[PDB]
Amino acid sequence: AFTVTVPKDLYVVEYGSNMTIECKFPVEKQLDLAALIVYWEMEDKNIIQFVHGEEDLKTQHSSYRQRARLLKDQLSLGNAALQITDVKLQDAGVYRCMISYGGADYKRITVKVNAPYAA
């Protein structure tokens, strides 16, 4: 069956750093861009919406403009990787990755953000 996996289900990231959280899904030798739909959400915020080989920025929440992107080259490897630069404290929480690719699945990932003076 179509299953989405997460290598790590809890990310502890430092304030102001860059974060890359990854969901893995099965891909054959070649990637069918028409069939792939990827949606990264947190709380009720539209982070990344990926359809027909391109990110849809018209629905992206303002909290993430030029702050987050889907690394398209990793999709070739069966990796939906969300990268968010300059992590803020308001980026901590539960992220959901939803992937449709023939079959459909989704997984949760928890992100803790470390305060600047916590280490």
């Binding site: 739909i37 959400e41 709380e43 009720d44 915020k45 539209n46 919406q49 959901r96 939803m98 449709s100």
Partner: peptide
């Protein structure tokens, strides 16, 4: 998130 029924019930964006 709109798109018909694609991941119906899996998301919270309205």
């Amino acid at each position: 998130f709109f798109x018909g029924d694609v991941f119906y019930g899996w998301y919270l964006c309205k």
